Amino acid sequence: VXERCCKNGKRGCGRWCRDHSRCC
């Protein structure tokens, strides 16, 4: 888990990515 942010880039940045993703 944690791929959506860096994978979607502009589409991955969000509250979930903010907590589960390193980028954004």
Give the list of residues 6+ apart from residue 10 with CB closer than 8 angstroms, or none: none
Task: Give the three-state DSSP class for 11.
Answer: helix
Q: How was this structure determined?
A: NMR
Give the list of residues 6+ apart from residue 12 with CB closer than 8 angstroms, or none: 3, 4, 5, 6, 21, 23, 24
Is residue 11 packed enough to be buried (19+ CB in 10 Å), middle (13-18) or exposed (0-12)? exposed
